């Protein structure tokens, strides 16, 4: 019969009593009941998204959301624009646009001293039409790898690689370059494998390098794709142009066979979480006086530059453009390297 | 969403650990999840059946079940069935089958002594294609009551009469009429209330009755029609005929216009209480030598005769036919007669 | 437009080159193309059931499937039978039926030495109505453990106890009561977690047990209900005594709200990993001049008896119902005591 | 809303108590509430069925019923197969199977004395897949014209002729063809004009006629088609001879087109009035002392043979051949020339 | 189950790495993934739009494009409109509006010299309410020929003539007129192949023309209709008096049995290839010193006119009514004579 | 409005009065109307089966229908089954059943002389769950051609080779190789073109051949697949073991991933043309003193052996097995060789 109740949605509400998230703090019940109905047109809810943040509780911040294909972040913006707008500190969705500029052309000046050890530079992209990493079937996902594995066949010169499928290779080869930043691990933690992101593995996955090892493109293991610029040295300048170059290659010849990157105006390059939109560009180093020191976390933070285990990074993605990207790295690290 | 979940049908299982009834006893979780889904084509439900019994928890035993329309007993029969066959003390409606036989010729003898006051015969009958009083709505009680109109404007003779409606009579004859039985209360007995069959009362409830005050006709209080044959002394065989030639005109008559009375072979004439289902007949008089005796109960009892309130009268009413109805009614009085 | 072709079943196949279970062997391309469009009631699917073998390859062997419903067995039947009958050494779930019976009345001897430490019954259920832990949302799962401690609250003398809640209690407890076998810890198992019945940990996860702590029911944890019956000594008369007479209780005060324990004549009880279908009993104990030996594993086997890391338990739970389990351990351990 | 209630079938039942046809007495309240909600494929109902005989009562015999596709005899066969039944006295479509013989080589004798005007033999077809005449449209109704005429452009020989509208042609050639028998009036007959056949007239309906005025066809007049073969004398072996030939060359061009006459083995032919079910065939004469006399009647029955205003013509259409019909008129006159 | 993914549009894409057409450098992966999905209400879809330009890649340029039914111009306008304002020099469908105005007595002048050999306008019309030549089933394209005969049967006086179906006519006269241009021959050209518009060839394809072979319409070969007006010399005055009186003539013989040309403002007369959009006029003439010149391809090009083997005819049809394109031809001609 | 009539099945029956095939003898009105509702899942249709027909009539005997997937020969088995009987001579599709037999172990003797060019055994296969090359999109035939090449990559051996696209090889080595019969030329064939088999030529198609040439797979030119054994000289019996062993290693290699061949016990293997069902198979050799006697015709037409322009070939595909075909030819050569 049609006159059987469903369930309220404040009775599927979650439990976030212990949690400390933006997740936690920006799911209201009237936003949850307002949200729960909706779903994008394949099938992808507001419970799957907010799965993983509720799975892990964390620890007092990761975002604990991600998206299950393009429509999400459309359809369930009502709550991740909050969590958009409070992680990249002040950009509005909603209000503000963000500019794509790729062009390596307007970059001004750029290198480490040799005495300072890998510059890489990383992004990562999703083909329009394709569900996301957390909602992809198995044919979708083999899909993208054979979208990406024929346009990447068409490079040519400097450029030229070959494809090597994790699950034809063996576990020492794949642990040698793990160690060598040259592959991705089986990835355990558990922030993705509540998103359902380690399905079927290692169907589908697999590894794209050029002969000299310094163009890196990871498939299906936490986006569609992940172009790695890597080299030895300080040489910013040359990383950079090798990636701006390889996307700029790689790009047309997916549209040669008819398929898009996804990327909005509002939002820029989409990708599963959140705190990746807009670029999700970052141009990193290896690199101690001013390790012992206190206030070098207070001139890192007043630097916008990020530090972690050795890998000087970037914080922001959305609102400035690449190129402003690594601008801000290299003249950050330049105001580091004086110090010595 | 279409991955919102019901309320498991567990859930709205009614509270029956202090009810003592048909219903209590044979409204199991398993027939109640079967049956939770099911629904008449107008719109009945399982619920709605037992309503009655879930809010009069009564007595250690009434039925506590309503039929919203005739389909109910057909769509409901794993929940009426055991009712219908535990309260008429046998009658399986699935295995046997139910005969008719109003044909008041066949009758032998049959004469109550004018000493002992006044003889009455009632049956009650449903329009077919129209909701029963617990489901009706205000346009079809309408239209029940302008059919029963029509067709009694066409009785000739000593049973033509005349149609009083409630609304539009004063409630001093009402009552007037309510003490000499020839009127129908209104009904605040809670074991109906609940039923929903005192909705907008009194609108399109009315009572028929012919010029002598012998043939009277109910509509709308209990079931679609109450014919009611009464007289003053112990002649049942006159009271009888007149019963049977009225049902029989007021059938044609309802049949000229084209419409039926709701029966079926294994069920009868289809009421809304299930006790009442087969011929619904009810054979009484009003009758004291056996009446402090403790023996009177035991030989009431053992002559298949029920004895209330100053009243004689029968149980069964599924099974056997209306003459055998009174055939003992009117053995079962004769050997009380002799009793004086 | 409706002329859109979709991925045929075949591109969805999994990758089963390298698995080794009963998945693998048993799983054509034929069965999965058939079985790909189904879905049960409550959405479950078939893609949802081989997800933990296809995420979790195993060793050369465990089963890698899960039911999400009750109906799953049933819509998936073509999947699941042969698993049934390869799992349970012949046991046809189409031909042959299962029959329970937990009356411990009929049970002959039985009785340990105390020298030989800890006796132990266990058995699961699950409610029907409302969804397996695999395919659970949070309103089902809190709904599960309502009915389970509003039921345990009707439990009177020595099978009177509190239901503790994991979310508030403390870790310590936690850990404690886990090495003494007086809780369930979070499942960190891939097997499971690929599952999703880690899912929202450790909301409206909980253990009941009895004051005097012989009495253990964990919730939502495996099953909607993992009942068990434990004792210092060898004393397994009076466990399974003990454990007959709660399941006993225990069902007669769910069954009084209006609740059922999922069971069919085919299968038995029905939970979610296949292998513990039929009665899901675990009779054990826990005890070494026959642990050097070479020939324990043979006499083992051939006794039916399933021996792991300290525990001496059984192996079938289908066909042979649980009066026969506890006798093939009491027997089986009978044998094993003599030998010293 | 969904919970309104629908006038019941009763409360539309046709008042027939001044009726007298086959349909008054054989539309009971049952039979009408049975079939109210049932429809054919293009919409027919049982009101627009029985609107003809509703709204003209007749005399104490005509049908009253009209069909409007080939489907109806199927969906309403509870209300036509009886009138089919009473109307051919005897035949069953139930149980018994027509048999169609156009084959005239198996004709014996049959010759009148010149002395005793024309003979005319009349059959009418129905075009598979568009709807009969009263229920078809404009668009259904040119269609019949364009096949019919396309078709008989065909015809070769002595079945040479030209097809003549009614709309492109006079008035005073129409009326002088009328009283020639070689036209169709306007049919005022309000019979007809209740059943909603006479709508858009002149539009589609035209006469096709060979040169010799002796093969004549009537299009959308009554049914698709009016086959007509007539001559002056009493020579109703030629006559029936080129009503066989035409009639198979007609449907043999049909049919190269692709189009075939409505035809069942229950039924016949199929046409708009029951009563010319079967073959639809009528082989009339035009023909005094055998006038005044009052046996005349009787031998005319009890030969089975029909008499009307000058016309000598047959009874029965359904259950015995074409081939026997003319034999049963040729025999019939036979016993009437003599007797003169 | 509707969990099943669907093939991305992107996958759906053709491969045009070696076409060169307006197709090829107007549908781009945006464009096909956005019109993928929509369809007209007839069924027509893009692919089968494109298919004529994906199956003959051409040479470095026709259009490669038709329209199914009306609706598609305007259903699939985001790919049409482009192309029909790259192939016509400027006109933007979506901003510009096109006026019809065949009223030839506003026409100046015009006449070639009898020494310069025939003239001959021609246009194409569609009719409204029946799918276009390439979405055209065999019942619709007999419905358009019945159409149209029954029009061209009210012509009179010079204009009446007679239609000659090509199936029922001989191949040798066929290619007489072939040659003599008084007829079509079966579509060979891949792009009407690819197209469909061969399908059922000869069916429902006849030729119309007038006893002086000066007005001819061919039906059903590449539109509904192709109105041509022909005759020897160089009086075009004459041509064009008969063509404008004739087209009116049959498009108010259209109008009497309620059917219509398709016709809109923006894109004025409607037919299968965009570049015969608004006018579908080609006003030719066959007519050698200006033929080993090489500046002859240079002043044709600059007088708007078009010159092919012997052909003198015109390049737009959009924009510029039906007298200004015969006055552009007279002009054109005109300056060409004089060169001799 | 739903009261709008379609179009009779009967106005869209295809005009076959000077057509000459099974197609135009099998296809009568009943049938046309009764198959003109019904579809495939993926959208097949009656008029695109027989577009091929009744595009080419032909000559006084092709099939002229196509099959768009798997379930045609199921939804239009009425149309194909007298067909398939027919061009068999004998073998009825719904009475006897077909048994594959590859197994090449029981062939007897056959070596053809040396003096006597080149053996080839040819078949065809379609991949289960994609669309048939008639009624194959864009995305269904690259993931055929996918399918193909990943499952001929694990060919080992002497059966390793290469793929060879069309799209990326030159014309001239494509004549060569067409010369040599080692590639399929772009087929323009209008029996084919008219089916809809040329579409999007040459997206998806390629061939697969050994290093040794000995090993031809022509992928999506007519069916699917189509797996030839070639070589020089009367080898026939290697010939037909390297068929059977690169067909078994084929099939195992495309259900190693989850793909199966279409196949039924009724009509075995399923293939677009009728004429191919069955087997598919065609064992072939070129080879003359019995080319001017007129008796040659003969004895081949008794030895169940066809001839045609330089080729000897068998007739029946449909009763017999695969090894019982080339017994026949290597028998019918038999006697062929002798005679000299």
Redesign the interface.
């Known amino acids: ?1 049609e ?5 309220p949605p404040s ?5 976030l009593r ?1 949690h400390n998230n933006c997740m936690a703090s920006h799911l209201t019940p009237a936003v949850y009941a307002r949200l ?4 994008t047109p ?2 992808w ?1 507001l ?1 799957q998204c907010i ?1 993983t943040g ?2 892990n509780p964390g620890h007092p911040k990761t975002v604990g959301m991600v998206a299950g294909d393009e429509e999400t972040y459309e359809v369930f913006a009502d709550l991740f624009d909050p969590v958009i707008q409070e992680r990249h500190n002040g950009y509005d969705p909603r209000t503000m646009k963000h500019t794509t500029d790729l062009d390596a052309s307007k970059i001004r000046s750029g290198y480490f001293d040799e005495r300072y050890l890998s510059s890489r530079v990383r992004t990562g992209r999703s ?5 996301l990493p957390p909602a992809c ?4 996902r ?2 993208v790898e ?1 979208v990406v594995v024929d346009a990447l066949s068409g490079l040519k010169g400097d450029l030229a690689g070959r494809y090597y499928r994790l ?1 034809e290779m063996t576990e020492a080869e794949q642990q040698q370059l793990i160690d060598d930043h040259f592959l991705f691990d089986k990835p355990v933690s558990p922030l993705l ?2 998103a359902g992101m ?4 290692p ?1 589908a996955r697999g590894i794209w390098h050029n002969n000299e090892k310094s163009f890196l493109i990871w498939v299906n293991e936490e986006d569609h794709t992940r172009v790695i610029s890597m080299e030895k040295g300080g040489n910013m300048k040359r990383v950079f142009e090798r990636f701006c170059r390889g996307l700029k290659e790689v790009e047309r010849l997916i ?6 990157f996804m990327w909005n105006e509002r939002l820029g390059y989409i990708l599963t979480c959140p705190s990746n939109l807009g670029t999700g560009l970052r141009a990193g180093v290896h690199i101690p006086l001013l390790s012992k020191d206190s206030r070098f976390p207070k001139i890192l933070e007043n630097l916008r530059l990020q530090k972690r285990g050795t890998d000087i990074s970037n914080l922001d993605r959305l609102g400035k453009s690449e190129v402003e990207l690594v601008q801000l790295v290299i003249d950050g690290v330049n105001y580091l390297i004086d110090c010595e």
């Open positions: 019969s006159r059987r109740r469903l369930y009775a599927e509400y979650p439990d212990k729960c109905d909706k779903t394949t099938g809810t419970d799965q509720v799975d083909i329009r039409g394709l569900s079937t198995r044919a979708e083999r899909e054979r699950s494998t509540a380690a399905r079927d593995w169907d549209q040669e066979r008819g398929w898009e």
